[PDB]
Amino acid sequence: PQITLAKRPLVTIKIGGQLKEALLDTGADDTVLEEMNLPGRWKPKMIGGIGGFIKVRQYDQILIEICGHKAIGTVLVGPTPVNIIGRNLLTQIGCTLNF
Amino acid sequence: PQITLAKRPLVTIKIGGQLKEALLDTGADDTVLEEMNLPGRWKPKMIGGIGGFIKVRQYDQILIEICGHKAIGTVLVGPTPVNIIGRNLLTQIGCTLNF
Numbered sequence: 001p002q003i004t005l006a007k008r009p010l011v012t013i014k015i016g017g018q019l020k021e022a023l024l025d026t027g028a029d030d031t032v033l034e035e036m037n038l039p040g041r042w043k044p045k046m047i048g049g050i051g052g053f054i055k056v057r058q059y060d061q062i063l064i065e066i067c068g069h070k071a072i073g074t075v076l077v078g079p080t081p082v083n084i085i086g087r088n089l090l091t092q093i094g095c096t097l098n099f
Numbered sequence: 100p101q102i103t104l105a106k107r108p109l110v111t112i113k114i115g116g117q118l119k120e121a122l123l124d125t126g127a128d129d130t131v132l133e134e135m136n137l138p139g140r141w142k143p144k145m146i147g148g149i150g151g152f153i154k155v156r157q158y159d160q161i162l163i164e165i166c167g168h169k170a171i172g173t174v175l176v177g178p179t180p181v182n183i184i185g186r187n188l189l190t191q192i193g194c195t196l197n198f
């Protein structure tokens with residue numbers, strides 16, 4: 001689809017057997033989700049944003065569906081107040097910015 | 100243009116008579132610039148993200164040119180490590196997400 005930006009670009013995703021809303025975020029290198037269970041023995045990882053760094057869990061090889069486009073990749077899980085879809089997945093589903 | 104997302108979407112901008120680069124950020128409601136001087140009245144504001152919170156100076160009616168496209172709006176100035184172009188300005192240049 002084509003998504004204007006008058007509102008937050010929230011879309012529905014499926015991950016870890018759960019339907020969720022997430023923000024399509026061109027300003028995120030990585031994908032960071034609110035607290036949830038995912039399979040795998042995670043590795044620690046640091047990410048930073050406005051306000052500072054947080055240590056999160058990195059899960060590799062995770063399946064995710066973003067508006068029905070399928071993807072597999074690394075997902076981070078930690079204390080983010082909003083589910084964020086980052087560029088690592090955005091490229092996979094062929095998402096571009098256009099003007 | 101059409102920007103793919105294998106790298107961060109950093110583009111050339113002009114603001115306050117200065118050439119700078121900024122991130123086109125669909126995950127930001129607001130526009131946030133690295134610490135700089137701007138003339139005129141401003142209000143203290145606070146914004147949230149991943150790291151938690153920062154304090155910023157809010158300026159209204161600021162002109163930024165973004166890849167040759169004018170936008171004018173509210174801009175926040177504070178301790179960000181990257182200049183961020185938010186949705187308030189991205190709409191004005193007709194920027195959309197496409198997949």
Ligand SMILES: CC(C)[C@H](NC(=O)[C@H](C)NC(=O)OCc1ccccc1)C(=O)N[C@@H](Cc1ccccc1)[C@@H](O)[C@H](O)[C@H](Cc1ccccc1)NC(=O)[C@@H](NC(=O)[C@H](C)NC(=O)OCc1ccccc1)C(C)C
Pocket residue numbers: 025026027028029030031032046047048049050051080081082084086124125126127128129131146147148149150151152179180181183
């Ligand atoms: C989501 C993160 C992975 C992302 N960070 C990154 O991509 C960084 C660069 N990458 C990274 O860390 O890579 C790992 C690494 C570490 C070390 C060395 C090398 C590599 C990020 O925070 N990106 C932000 C930009 C940034 C980057 C670095 C440093 C400072 C700022 C926004 O672009 C991004 O689009 C977020 C998305 C978001 C939305 C909502 C909540 C949290 C995050 N927006 C924002 O922070 C914006 N906030 C908003 O639009 C609003 C209004 N705030 C909000 O909703 O927050 C409420 C809140 C309050 C209190 C606590 C928590 C939340 C913003 C710039 C104004």
Ligand SMILES: O=C(O)c1ccc2ccccc2c1Br
Pocket residue numbers: 014015016017063064065070071072
């Ligand atoms: O859980 C699902 O329904 C599901 C089913 C098949 C998938 C295939 C590829 C990526 C995600 C997938 C997801 Br998230």
Ligand SMILES: O=C(O)c1ccc2ccccc2c1Br
Pocket residue numbers: 113118
């Ligand atoms: O980008 C330009 O076209 C331009 C051209 C000439 C300039 C001369 C002085 C300062 C900025 C300038 C800029 Br910002």
Ligand SMILES: [Br-]
Pocket residue numbers: 143144145
């Ligand atoms: Br304040």
